[PDB]
Design a protein around this ligand. Sequence first.
Ligand SMILES: [Mg+2]
Ligand SMILES: [Zn+2]
Ligand SMILES: [Zn+2]
Ligand SMILES: [Zn+2]
Ligand SMILES: [Zn+2]
Lengths: 355, 608, 111
Amino acid sequence: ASLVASIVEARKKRTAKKNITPYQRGIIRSLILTLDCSEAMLEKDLRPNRHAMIIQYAIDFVHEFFDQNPISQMGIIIMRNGLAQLVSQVSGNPQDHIDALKSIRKQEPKGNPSLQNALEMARGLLLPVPAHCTREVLIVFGSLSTTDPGDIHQTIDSLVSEKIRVKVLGLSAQVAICKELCKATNYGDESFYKILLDETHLKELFNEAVTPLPVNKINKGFTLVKMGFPTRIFEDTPTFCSCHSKLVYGGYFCPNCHSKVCSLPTVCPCCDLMLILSTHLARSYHHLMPLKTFAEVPTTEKFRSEDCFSCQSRFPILTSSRYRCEDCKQEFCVDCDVFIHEILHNCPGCESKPV
Amino acid sequence: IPADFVPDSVSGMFRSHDFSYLRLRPDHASRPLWISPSDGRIILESFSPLAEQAQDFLVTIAEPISRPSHIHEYKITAYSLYAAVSVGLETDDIISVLDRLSKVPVAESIINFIKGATISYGKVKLVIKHNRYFVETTQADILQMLLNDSVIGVHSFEIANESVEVVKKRCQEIDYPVLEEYDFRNDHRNPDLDIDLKPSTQIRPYQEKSLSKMFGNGRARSGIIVLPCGAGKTLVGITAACTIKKSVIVLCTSSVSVMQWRQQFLQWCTLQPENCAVFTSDNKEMFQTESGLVVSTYSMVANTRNRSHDSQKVMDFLTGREWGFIILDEVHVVPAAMFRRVVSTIAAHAKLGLTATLVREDDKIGDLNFLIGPKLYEANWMELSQKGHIANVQCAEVWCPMTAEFYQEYLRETARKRMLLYIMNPTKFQACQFLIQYHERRGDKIIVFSDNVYALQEYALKMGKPFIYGSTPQQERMNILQNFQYNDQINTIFLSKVGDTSIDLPEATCLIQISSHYGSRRQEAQRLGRILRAKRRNDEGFNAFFYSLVSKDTQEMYYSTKRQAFLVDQGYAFKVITHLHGMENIPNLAYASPRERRELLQEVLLKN
Amino acid sequence: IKPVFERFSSVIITSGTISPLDMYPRMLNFKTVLQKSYAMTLAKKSFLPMIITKGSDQVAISSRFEIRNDPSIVRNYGSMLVEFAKITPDGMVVFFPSYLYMESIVSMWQT
Ligand SMILES: [Mg+2]
Ligand SMILES: [Zn+2]
Ligand SMILES: [Zn+2]
Ligand SMILES: [Zn+2]
Ligand SMILES: [Zn+2]
């Protein structure tokens, strides 16, 4: 009787994903993850302790964020002992923040949090940020309270005025002030103050936070942006780099001012212009071109085919596991459905079918 | 054998052990039970269904031989089947449930064994009417056969109190066992004691199971209840007394235990300190109330060498009182010859036995069947360890490499002094010093156990922290105990056979053994139970630490193996450590220089 | 209530925590035309009542003024007060039966 429970669970899951929309979603991102390292995360209540798992999950989050969206800079400020401590400036290299987080590994989480100080200096760090960049902050929190020097509502008003959004991933339960932050910052939405139920749910939440977010019509910033593809050289001689001032065998060359750099996707240090590859911009095209869900045909009706169109395996036989791409009119197995919907980003049935 | 069972070429060492002649049921996936008919053993899976329902049934009708995490080795015994039918169970139901949950066909010998181990339950009973052991059986059919027996010499007749133990052994021998289920509600000949279960006491589930197994009919079934260290046996006895509401006497084998159980009893039951009169050489007062209690250890009833007249008056008073309930806490010592006068002296109806270990060197532990009765309940030790009712220990057995400095004299020493000569190794002193350093570095209270007072005091003096043994007076030992508990000057202490058992010292999560008995497993088991009742047995990431410094190149390895094998079979393993940690990182080592080693060698040569 | 009842007929007596209904016409000489309540037609559980009959050490607790200065009952009271304070996110209220009972027990937890 487990298949009926699985079916009704899949129905209640798919009721949320019935509506799939091609919203304009931010690509030039600006993501900040502040960390609290206080007495609360010293609890071993989840194995091994909250501090260790948020360290590991932040490592994964950095990797996933830079993989999916390499067109953003990442800054991390830790919270400790009534002080918020900047440990990671916004940068194109994830490895810097990886090393900073590795430093955060060995140190000891202790103290009390101050979202006022944390968000204030996060605002100040987010101040010299260009218009197209979408300023947004992830906040992790384990306390049920917050010691603060002054008002939080002035900070809330300033953050709303400066067009920065937040998303809170609280640990224990809901905190009303964090709900207020999420609602007021997020145009009244309640889809940003999220509480886990276990570590797997925390993993899923982090994966959810990886994704780009849609933007609002009223928050209109539709413009152009100057861009430059550089050229890579492979020279015999080591050559001084502009950024780190040291001898480099290879390195890309600046398209505009003909200097050289060491890493991409990065902006020029000399002509001060952003340099990318077409792979980097095409990386988010699945977000730009979403994929429709695939429908299982019912077991009662007559079937177009009895084996999987894509992976080429036999469909198993009570119910019918034939997920149909209505855009290509072909049914598929669950494994192929998962792979095409998540790993792949094209429908080979729609590739074979001519338009 | 449900087969021809032609002997296989690989069954040669399987001396009737190749158990593949059985026709395994296709329901072997669901059913958790095998039967081993060669030795009566039972093989039980810990990963197949019906085991949760069958666990209590297998405890009731069978004894476990070994219970690791994967496969429980049980064994049906006639003792366990008598315990089953005493709880209230029968052969046919046992056979039916066994075939219901058994992967294998039920063996003929096991069927016959359970058929034989069915008692005349209810036929043979005894009651006390005004301190008189009246053998009240339901029929004269019992009277005919019992008078047919030559030992004896509805209807009730007298058997003398010392003759009661002998005739109970005899009727167990002729398999006509007596049940002692007091109708304390129906009997009002004894003075009822107005003691109530306070709402401040609420009972653990396994303790409720222990009560209801011996309170199935509402009467108090008499026997043994074996519970681990710190399980709440005092709470179980308090609950039994409060639901019996009669005159009750409980004896434990320490005056410290007398003090602690008296305060426990006046704490968690509504009996009054007036009703409780404590008997010892401190004071021999009596309560004058119709109902109440008098507590003493077993010594003030056993002894007749140096007795006071007030002691004589008190033992006369307790002889006069016809009690309704008796509990012999730490029941492992009462079947000793100077201690088994309990039936001969005390007139008490219900006989319950609460202890941690149900093992000893000889077979006096089975005498409790005809002294107090069978085991009414036991709690599974690893189940309570995972439940947090008892602790989880990372025991680390330290194989100290033997120094030739002491071995050269140890080999030529005479036998009575070889022991004290190989206890005192300078390498062992070095290892103990760094271990104390390392666990005070970890911040653990450490208790050191030595079997010899001189070794205990030498280790204590080399530490610079005091010692407690059996010859130390009570006032000095409690002063040292409170100094250890509260004073930070006394970080560790040096305990002995007054610390091995019958005390409440659970703070020491770290324990280092430098010496022990020759082969007494119960002393080592009680030493393990000293830290098994530790307070932080419930917090996450906890593992208690047990250490045994044993000299190599001796028989002490086999001695420690013998002393530890019960705990290993329980589930408390003894891991191998020979090359220790931090052996030279410690700067100062006790008797490190060879001149210091020869110094201590000739110092102990002064005695050996 | 006699001037009220004999001056006005269209009088509605209702509340949220009146139980049993008949006890108020029992204590006051009046009668009503219909006596019924309303059940909570709830989709899912939203209120979780507990009856703490025993402390952390399985020790019962009561508010009786004789046993009022019991240190063990104090220990239990402060115990779950601390625990609920630690797990309570936003706002929690405490309701003792009497002010003197408070003043005693708060002064000695202050101790
Ligand atoms: Mg001792
Ligand atoms: Zn460079
Ligand atoms: Zn440039
Ligand atoms: Zn497929
Ligand atoms: Zn398609």
